[PDB]
Write a protein that binds this ligand. Structure first.
Ligand SMILES: O=C(C1CCS(=O)(=O)CC1)N1CC[C@](c2ccc(OCc3ccccc3)cc2)(S(=O)(=O)c2ccc(F)cc2)C1
Length: 253
């Protein structure tokens, strides 16, 4: 199954689907690198309440995940899977895709991330009270920045993060397996053609993405236990569904 001309076509459709749903253009994020938060603006974030910061971050994550849902819907073969499998793959992989996509918004020169219009370091998130999770995210982006990914590499690698046949809950495991194998062939074909197979050994282990997602869910249970009405009243419904039937509605459209 699948010849070279079908694998090359798969490369281009994955790359196109990603460009159409990448949220912020790479050029836009790069042209903003000199726009950094002043020490007074950083102090303003540190002085914000923990629940306000948690609500702003959960809001930004939700928006980014909505683009990931759109990337999945445009991905060859994903809409062909059953709804249960689509939801299982999105519930487990949407946050993982966002964690990879996030390296485009990270400047490794000053160790800053693009957040709410300007670049800021780890210290911008001190009010969250989850320094271990923040450092883990920042280190993860630092590690991905050393790979010097092209937009096409991120498109192909994020399609594979999402189409994972080993996710618990899958009803048509073989159909996801076949789709995964085709995307793996297309990612490796593209790396071989561009003389970039050296990155395979340097890609993060699968347990690193699982550890980041786990730390997120753990820090959320801590925050929710202290502010259950804040999560209930001010957190996005899609966020609560994923981490605490929006997905079904987003997939129907
Ligand atoms: O970077 C993006 C976007 C990706 C798509 S794009 O087009 O390149 C524009 C940028 N992000 C989308 C949202 C972001 C996000 C990342 C991780 C995350 O983890 C869960 C969490 C929740 C609450 C507290 C701590 C951690 C939540 C949101 S963010 O808010 O900017 C943020 C950033 C750093 C950080 F350390 C914490 C929050 C990253």
């Amino acid at each position: 199954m699948a010849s070279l001309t079908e694998i090359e076509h798969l490369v281009q459709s994955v790359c196109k689907s990603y460009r159409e749903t990448c949220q912020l253009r790479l050029e836009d994020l790069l042209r903003q690198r000199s726009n950094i938060f002043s020490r007074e603006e950083v102090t303003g974030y540190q002085r914000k309440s923990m629940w306000e910061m948690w609500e702003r971050c959960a809001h930004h994550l939700t928006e980014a995940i909505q683009y990931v849902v759109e990337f999945a819907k445009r991905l060859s073969g994903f809409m062909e899977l059953c709804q249960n499998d689509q939801i299982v793959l999105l519930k487990a992989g949407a946050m993982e895709v966002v964690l990879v996509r996030m390296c485009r918004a990270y400047n490794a020169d000053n160790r800053t991330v693009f957040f709410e219009g300007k670049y800021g370091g780890m210290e911008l998130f001190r009010a969250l009270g989850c320094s271990e999770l923040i450092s883990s995210i920042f280190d993860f982006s630092h590690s991905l920045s050393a790979l010097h990914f092209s937009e096409d590499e991120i498109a192909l690698y994020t399609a594979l993060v999402l189409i994972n046949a080993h996710r618990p809950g899958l009803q048509e495991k073989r159909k996801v397996e076949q789709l995964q194998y085709n995307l793996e062939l297309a990612f490796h074909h593209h790396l071989c053609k561009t003389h970039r197979q050296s990155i395979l050994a340097k890609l993060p282990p699968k347990g690193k993405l699982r550890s980041l997602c786990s730390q997120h869910v753990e820090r959320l249970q801590i925050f929710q236990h202290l502010h259950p009405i804040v999560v209930q009243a001010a957190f996005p419904p899609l966020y609560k569904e994923l981490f605490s039937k929006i997905l079904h509605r987003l997939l129907q459209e």
